[PDB]
């Protein structure tokens with residue numbers, strides 16, 4: 001695996017065909033590797049980027065606190081069979097004079113995570129657009145854990161016409177169900193025990209949906225699950241349309257349950273298909 | 277030459293390399309042809325788009341009356357040796373659900389045209405980004421007459437990483453100096469006679485610059501020239517830095533004289549290098 005940190009070397013190290021791409025912010029875990037394997041198996045050349053993007057971190061968030069361990073990532077990727085690792089510095093990605101932004105507007109970015117993290121999706125859209133242009137991938141892989149982000153990237157791709165196939169990969173979970181996330185390291189031993197509540201709430205809703213319950217009844221079951229863990233401050237809990245993320249008035253194939261909230265030392269999010 | 281109106285036909289007809297691209301809003305004139313000849317000479321495959329982009333027009337502007345005649349444009353491009361003409365409908369460029377925008381921030385889009393036309397450059401950046409992604413050109417050609425627009429496109433390309441070489445082509449003018457423009461068709465016979473005043477003012481500033489006069493002296497000469505035509509209501513007249521568009525206190529190579537204003541039936545703009 002060749003490691004590069006500049007745009008110049010990146011472009012020269014890239015073939016024009018069969019590129020599978022996996023954008024990440026470093027401090028990789030079992031979950032990221034699932035994306036890399038998927039990419040490795042489907043494309044002759046695999047590229048993974050590691051870059052903590054300042055643009056998607058807003059006021060009051062964890063930019064400087066974000067987990068960083070390049071050598072650990074470089075060793076993990078090298079072993080995963082990745083051909084190219086792009087680990088640029090902030091000034092390589094955003095040199096002096098940088099002033100362009102890409103943003104998906106409307107309900108897709110105004111609701112849920114967009115309401116809790118204003119400006120977050122503009123930062124994501126901007127860095128993804130740039131990465132797609134620098135890498136020119138045939139396929140790009142994203143985790144379903146960040147479902148809204150996945151839809152935002154798909155919308156930007158469809159709207160602007162990027163010739164990139166965006167692939168969503170199922171969420172990797174711990175035995176107790178806690179979705180893997182680099183931010184889980186924030187959790188203390190005690191909070192980690194309560195963390196499974198998000199997935200628990202989501203399962204409660206899927207259960208009602210399977211028993212023939214209404215959307216409203218499913219939401220109630222989910223609310224109750226969360227209420228049992230007051231330490232968890234809920235941001236939102238809903239059952240939304242799989243493509244528009246609008247609250248559902250009735251069930252539709254692919255109905256998505258989404259939840260988010262925060263414990264004192266960290267914020268967590270999760271989602272799951274509740275119907276059928 | 278072949279004419280296509282859908283993204284599907286476009287992508288299927290495009291080669292992977294050697295594409296020279298000229299984006300336009302139609303109702304072509306000799307000036308557009310200069311861009312086309314430049315692209316034809318420097319590239320094996322030439323693509324021209326004709327699309328009046330609603331995103332770059334304001335509510336009180338001329339979107340509805342903008343000159344349109346695809347047949348005449350086709351005949352012209354046919355003789356010019358163009359390979360592919362992309363003439364999409366609004367529905368094809370911006371289908372239901374379209375919600376993404378691209379914008380260059382800062383003084384570059386806030387000054388001059390950006391102040392007179394709020395949101396104009398976001399509209400330009402957005403459609404150009406999309407056209408670049410659909411066409412995937414090696415080189416894209418723009419007229420220097422819309423100098424600020426040329427810089428904005430260059431900044432977007434530089435920032436996002438578009439593998440596109442943006443070529444600026446010198447302005448084509450009538451014998452009396454008026455820069456050719458599709459909107460010149462709005463001018464009444466009497467106004468057309470007074471319209472050369474913008475170019476005259478620019479020439480007056482270059483004259484002073486060439487004689488060793490100061491920037492301030494050059495501006496006075498330009499203002500005096502404009503005052504000869506009271507029917508012309510100036511938006512701005514300045515001598516600016518060629519890259520930042522900031523007003524100059526002293527001469528620098530590439531110093532650009534820029535002017536814009538309105539006649540009752542049409543708004544005109546023009547610019548010229550006044551130094552050295």
Ligand SMILES: [Cl-]
Pocket residue numbers: 023024025026
């Ligand atoms: Cl990540």
Ligand SMILES: [Cl-]
Pocket residue numbers: 056057
């Ligand atoms: Cl983040």
Ligand SMILES: [Cl-]
Pocket residue numbers: 299300301302
């Ligand atoms: Cl045009």
Ligand SMILES: [Cl-]
Pocket residue numbers: 332333
């Ligand atoms: Cl316009």
Ligand SMILES: [Cl-]
Pocket residue numbers: 334335336337
């Ligand atoms: Cl307006």
